[PDB]
C-alpha cells in the first residue's frame, strides 16, 4: 500500500517470477501490478496438470522468496491460491419502485444475499463490485475539525 | 459517535460525532451498476477451479428464489447474463442431432435391405456397441461430454 | 518427493505451537531441495580494473539474479552474503564530539526512512464534482544513499543541521570481511550453481 | 479389416498429448472402441441371428 | 486431383476451433485517462441505449468503473455484459451483432468501446479474440515501450483481417506527488508518523481496527468530508500538531508537482511488457489474425522486442503442424496392418490411395463453404482414412 | 549494542530496481573490548549518559 506499479513491479513481482519460475509444467505467467498498491501474478501451467499439486508447487517457492520481499510486503502476508476466469453468471438486483435508491440495495446485498450465494457449492468468488464488504466509515469534517483544535 | 475526544473542564465532552460524520458501510460513488438503463448492483458468480459448471448454476437460481422470499418491497432479480443457458442449449441440440441421425441411417438402411427383420438385426449393433464403449470410457477414466457426444 | 514435503508441511503446524515468541516472528520455513550443486563458476578481474570486491559487486548487481532466472536453477549463490545492505558505519569518536548514541541514529533512520502514502483528487466526498480524477502520493521513502546522509540528527539553533553524514559514513553493499574467493592463486568470487530439486 | 484399420488409424493418436491430443482422444477413443464392438457383434450376434 | 489437394490445402486458412454464438457478448469500454467516474457513467449510458435497441440483444448490464480485465476498479474505464434473444427468436447471429456495433463505435472519440464474443472454450481467456504480450528486453522504460507499442497496434488496424487491436499499458494518467521540505519538516518540529497518518486520514483512507455487529465482522475506516476545490486548498485546512503544541499546516513544508506515469505495469514471462488484444476482422480466421499480427511486429519492432501468446492464440500457435504426424501414422499402421493380413506388399498399396479422393473431397467442400482448416477438420481427416479404406479392402 | 559491535537492522529502502537492507554498524578503532566498552556510550531516563 502506497507503492507505484513501477516499484511494486520491480522489487515485489519479480522476486516471486523469478522465484515460481522454472515451476513444474508452467507455460507463462502474466503480472499486473498497480498504483492502488496491488500486484497480481498468474501462473499458467500446461494443459492437463494437476491444478492442486501446481499450487502447493507455488506455495512451496513463495516461502523462499519471502525472505527478499520488503519489509511493508511480509507485514501484511503474501497469499496464492488456485482460481479460474470463468465467470457463469451475474445476477442484477434493483428497486423496481424506486424506493431502496441504488446504495440501499447494495446494503441488502451485502448483509443477506452475498454470503448465502458464497455459500452454494462451486461458487468460487460472488463479490458486488465495488466495496469488501464494507466498513464503518467516519468522515472527519476539517472545518469542525480546526474550529474545534 | 459518542467516542470522546477531548474531556472539558464543564465535565461535558467533545465527541466524534462533533467533528465526524459516522456512517455504516454503503460505500459507493466509486462503482455503478445498470441494467437496461436503471440502478443495479451486479452480483457476479465465479465459478471455483474444477467444479460441474453446469450443476452449480441450477444451485445459484435455487437459492436466489429463497432469498426471493425475505426481498421487501419491489426489491427483485435478474440472472441476465447466464452462460449455463447455452451448455443446456448446445447439449438439446447434440440429442437432437444423435436422435435425427439415428432415423436417417435406419432409413437408409430399410431402403437397402429392403424388409424389417433385415434391418432390425443390423440396428442390434447400435445399442451393444455405443451402449458397450461407456463400460470402456469408465474404465479408462473418460467422461460424457460435448466432444465425446 | 512432494507427499513427503506436504506430510512434513502439515507436522510443522502442530509444533509452531511450542516455538519460542522469538522464532514465531520470522516464521519456520520448509521445502523440497536437493544436496548437490550442479556447478561452481569463478569470476575475477584479468588486470587490476575492478577490486577483489567491485567485482563481488557488479555480480550482486547484475550476475546473481541473471542466473536465478535460466530454468532448473535451484540457486545462485556468491560465496558471501545473505541479502545486500546500505551500511551505516558510525564513527563512535565523532558521535562522542556531537553528543549523539547510538539509540539516536537508530531512531533517526527509523523514523526519517518512512513508507508511502496514496490519495485520489476528485474523490466525490473530498472534492468538487470536476472532470479529470488525479492520484496524489507522497514519498517519503530514501532512494538514493545521499539522502540516508541528509537524515537530520539533530535541529541547531543557527538554522544550520547536524545530519547523518557529520558523524559516519555511508556505504553500499559489499564489506568482504566474510569470505575470500580465490581461482589459481588469484583473488576471485566464487558462485556455486546449485540444480533445482527435480 | 474394417475394424482392424480404424484401429490402425485412431489408436496411435490416443497416445498424444495436448490441446489437440486431449481433444482427439474423445474421438479416437469412442470409435475405437465402438466399431471394435460393431465388429465383434457382426462376427457373432448377427450371423447367428439371421 | 493429387496436387489439387496441395492447392486446396494453401487456399484453406487456419483456426483451433470455431468461436461459438453462445448467446452472450460483452464490451469493453475505456474513457480518456484521465476522465472522472461521472464522465464514465455518462457515456456508458448513452452506448447502453444503443447497444440495447439493436437487433439480436434482449438486455444490457453494465459495471462502471471496472476493469474486466484487472478485475480492479479504475474510474476510466467500464464493461457491459450483453444477453442476445433466444436463438430461436433472432434473425442474426452474434458474430454479425458484434460486428455491427463495432462498426457503428468506431470512430466515438468521447471512449473507446470494444465488442468482443465469449472465450471457446470457458478458461481459455476472458473474452474471445486473440491476447499477445509484446515484451522488452532492452531494459528500456515504460514510456518509450508505450510509444514503439502504439506504433504497432497503430499499423495493426491498419490491416484487413485485424479489427479492434488495442493496448492495456495507459502511461498518461496525470499523477500529482507530494514532495516533502525535510529540512521544513523539522524546522517545524513534527513526527514523520503524525504526518502520514494526518495525510492518510483525510486525502486517502486510514484503518484503524475492526469491531463486530450484526453477526458480521467490519472495518473502521477514516476519511475526510472536507470540500476542497483544488488541492492547494485542502493543504492549507488540513493540520498537524508539532512536538511542542504548534499546529502545522500541510500547505508549508509539502510542495505539490504534477508528473504522469503509468497506473498499472505488467510483466509477462520476467520482461516488462506490453498486452495487446484484438480479434479478426469480420470473415477472417483465427489463424489468419495471428499471421497478421506477427507479421506486422516484425515490421513495427526492434530487435530489442518479441511477442509471447497467451489463451486461444497460444495453442494455435503451439500447435501448428501437429496434423501431419497424426495423419502420417495412422496411414503407415493402415498399411501394415494390410500388409500382415493379406500377405501382400501390394494389396494394401491400392487400398492407400483411396485416401487421397477423401481429403480431396473434404478440402473441396470446406473451401467451397468458406469453412477452415481447424482442429475439428482435421480429426475429420483422421476419421476418413479409416472410412475410406474401408471402401477399398471391400473391392481389393 | 547491536549497533556497534554486531549489526543493527533499521528498516529497508528501493534503489535501482532492487530492495537493499539498511544496516547500522561501529566503525571504531577496537584496541581491545575491555576499551570499546568506554566509548560506547547510552543515555539513561534522566538525560545522563552512561
Not at chain 1, 499486473?32 to 506455495?59: C, E, H, K, R, W
Not at chain 2, 424389417?116 to 470410457?137: E, H, K, N, W
Not at chain 5, 481496527?209 to 477514516?222: P, R, T
Request: charged share 20%; net charge neutral; glycine share 6%.
Amino acid at each position: 500500500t502506497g507503492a507505484d506499479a513501477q516499484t511494486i513491479a520491480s522489487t515485489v513481482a519479480s522476486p516471486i517470477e523469478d522465484a515460481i519460475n522454472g515451476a513444474d509444467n508452467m507455460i507463462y505467467m502474466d503480472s499486473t501490478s498497480s498504483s492502488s498498491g496491488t500486484m497480481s501474478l498468474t501462473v499458467y501451467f500446461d494443459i492437463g496438470t494437476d491444478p492442486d499439486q501446481a499450487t502447493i508447487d507455488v506455495n512451496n517457492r513463495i516461502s523462499a522468496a519471502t525472505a527478499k520481499m520488503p519489509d511493508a510486503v511480509k507485514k501484511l502476508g503474501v497469499t496464492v491460491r488456485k482460481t479460474s476466469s470463468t465467470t457463469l453468471a451475474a445476477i442484477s438486483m434493483y428497486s423496481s419502485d424506486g424506493s431502496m435508491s441504488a446504495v440501499d440495495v447494495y446494503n441488502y446485498i451485502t448483509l443477506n444475499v452475498l454470503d448465502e450465494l458464497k455459500r452454494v457449492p462451486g461458487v468460487g468468488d460472488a463479490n458486488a463490485i465495488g466495496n469488501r464488504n464494507y466498513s464503518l466509515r467516519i468522515w472527519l469534517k476539517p472545518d469542525l475539525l480546526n474550529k474545534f483544535g | 459517535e459518542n467516542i470522546i475526544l477531548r474531556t472539558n473542564n464543564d465535565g461535558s465532552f467533545l465527541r466524534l460525532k462533533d467533528v465526524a460524520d459516522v456512517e455504516i458501510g454503503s460505500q459507493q460513488y466509486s462503482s455503478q451498476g445498470r441494467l437496461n438503463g436503471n440502478d443495479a448492483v451486479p452480483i457476479m458468480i465465479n465459478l471455483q477451479s474444477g467444479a460441474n459448471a453446469l450443476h452449480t448454476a441450477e444451485l445459484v437460481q435455487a437459492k436466489m428464489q429463497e432469498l426471493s422470499k425475505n426481498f421487501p418491497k419491489g426489491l427483485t432479480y435478474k440472472i441476465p447474463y447466464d452462460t449455463t443457458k447455452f451448455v443446456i442449449e448446445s447439449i438439446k441440440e447434440v440429442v437432437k442431432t444423435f436422435v435425427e441421425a439415428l432415423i436417417l441411417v435406419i432409413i437408409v438402411m430399410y431402403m437397402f435391405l429392403k424388409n424389417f427383420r433385415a434391418t432390425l438385426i443390423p440396428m442390434i449393433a447400435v445399442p451393444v456397441s455405443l451402449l458397450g464403449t461407456f463400460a470402456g470410457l469408465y474404465v479408462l477414466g473418460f467422461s460424457i461430454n460435448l466432444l465425446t457426444l | 518427493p512432494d507427499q513427503a514435503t506436504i506430510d512434513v508441511n502439515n507436522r510443522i503446524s502442530a509444533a509452531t505451537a511450542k516455538m519460542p515468541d522469538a522464532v514465531k516472528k520470522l516464521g519456520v520455513t520448509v521445502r523440497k531441495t536437493s544436496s548437490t550443486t550442479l556447478a561452481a563458476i569463478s569470476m575475477y578481474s584479468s588486470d587490476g580494473s575492478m577490486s577483489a570486491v567491485d567485482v563481488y559487486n557488479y555480480i550482486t548487481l547484475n550476475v546473481l539474479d541473471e542466473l536465478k532466472r535460466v530454468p532448473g536453477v535451484g540457486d545462485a549463490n556468491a560465496i558471501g552474503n545473505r541479502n545486500y545492505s546500505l551500511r551505516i558505519w558510525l564513527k563512535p569518536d565523532l558521535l562522542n564530539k556531537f553528543g549523539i548514541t547510538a539509540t539516536d541514529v537508530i531512531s533517526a533512520v527509523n523514523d526519517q526512512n518512512a513508507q508511502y502514502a496514496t490519495g485520489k483528487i476528485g474523490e466525490e466526498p473530498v472534492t468538487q464534482k470536476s472532470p479529470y480524477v488525479y492520484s496524489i502520493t507522497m514519498q517519503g521513502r530514501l532512494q538514493n544513499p545521499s539522502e540516508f546522509e541528509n537524515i537530520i540528527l539533530r535541529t541547531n539553533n543557527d538554522g544550520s543541521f547536524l545530519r547523518l553524514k557529520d558523524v559516519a559514513d555511508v556505504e553500499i553493499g559489499s564489506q568482504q570481511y566474510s569470505s575470500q574467493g580465490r581461482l589459481n592463486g588469484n583473488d576471485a568470487v566464487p558462485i556455486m550453481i546449485n540444480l533445482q530439486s527435480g | 479389416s474394417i475394424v482392424l484399420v480404424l484401429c490402425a488409424v485412431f489408436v496411435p493418436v490416443s497416445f498424444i498429448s495436448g490441446f489437440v491430443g486431449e481433444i482427439q482422444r474423445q474421438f479416437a477413443l469412442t470409435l475405437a472402441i465402438s466399431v471394435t464392438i460393431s465388429g465383434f457383434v457382426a462376427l457373432t450376434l448377427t450371423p447367428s441371428l439371421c | 486431383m493429387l496436387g489439387a489437394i496441395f492447392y486446396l490445402y494453401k487456399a484453406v486458412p487456419n483456426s483451433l476451433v470455431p468461436e461459438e454464438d453462445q448467446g452472450l457478448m460483452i464490451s469493453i469500454i475505456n474513457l480518456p485517462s484521465a476522465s472522472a467516474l461521472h464522465r464514465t457513467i455518462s457515456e456508458v449510458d448513452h452506448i447502453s441505449q444503443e447497444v440495447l435497441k439493436t437487433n439480436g440483444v434482449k438486455d444490457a448490464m453494465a459495471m462502471i468503473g471496472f476493469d474486466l480485465f484487472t478485475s480492479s476498479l479504475k474510474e476510466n474505464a467500464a464493461a457491459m455484459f450483453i444477453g442476445l434473444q433466444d436463438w430461436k427468436d433472432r434473425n442474426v447471429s452474434a458474430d454479425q451483432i458484434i460486428a455491427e456495433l463495432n462498426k457503428k463505435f468506431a470512430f466515438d472519440r468521447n471512449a473507446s468501446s470494444v465488442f468482443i464474443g465469449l472465450p471457446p472454450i470457458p478458461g481459455l481467456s476472458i473474452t474471445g479474440g486473440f491476447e499477445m504480450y509484446v515484451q522488452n528486453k532492452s531494459g528500456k522504460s515504460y514510456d518509450e515501450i508505450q510509444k514503439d507499442v502504439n506504433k504497432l497496434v497503430a499499423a495493426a488496424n491498419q490491416r484487413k483481417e485485424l479489427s479492434r487491436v488495442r493496448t492495456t499499458l495507459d502511461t498518461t494518467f496525470p499523477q500529482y506527488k507530494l514532495i516533502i521540505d525535510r529540512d521544513k519538516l523539522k524546522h517545524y518540529n513534527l513526527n514523520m508518523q503524525d504526518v502520514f497518518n494526518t495525510m492518510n486520514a483525510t486525502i486517502g483512507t486510514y484503518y484503524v481496527n475492526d469491531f463486530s455487529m450484526l453477526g458480521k465482522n467490519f472495518q473502521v475506516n477514516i476519511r475526510a468530508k472536507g470540500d476542497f476545490r483544488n488541492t492547494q486548498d485542502a493543504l492549507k485546512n488540513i493540520f498537524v500538531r508539532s512536538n511542542d503544541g504548534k499546529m502545522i499546516p500541510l500547505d508549508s513544508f509539502l510542495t505539490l508537482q504534477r508528473s504522469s506515469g503509468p497506473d498499472d505495469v505488467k510483466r509477462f514471462n520476467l520482461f516488462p511488457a506490453a498486452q495487446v488484444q484484438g480479434q479478426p476482422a469480420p470473415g477472417y480466421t483465427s489463424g489468419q489474425a495471428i499471421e497478421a499480427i506477427a507479421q506486422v511486429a516484425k515490421e513495427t519492432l526492434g530487435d530489442d522486442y518479441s511477442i509471447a501468446w497467451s489463451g486461444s492464440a497460444y495453442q494455435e500457435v503451439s500447435s501448428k503442424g501437429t496434423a501431419s504426424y497424426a495423419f502420417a501414422l495412422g496411414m503407415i499402421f493402415v498399411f501394415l496392418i494390410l500388409a500382415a493380413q493379406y500377405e501382400r506388399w501390394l494389396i494394401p498399396l491400392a487400398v492407400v490411395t483411396a485416401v487421397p479422393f477423401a481429403v480431396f473431397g473434404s478440402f473441396l467442400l470446406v473451401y467451397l463453404r468458406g469453412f477452415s482448416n481447424d482442429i475439428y477438420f482435421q480429426t475429420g481427416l483422421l476419421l476418413l482414412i479409416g472410412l475410406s479404406a474401408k471402401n477399398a479392402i471391400l473391392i481389393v
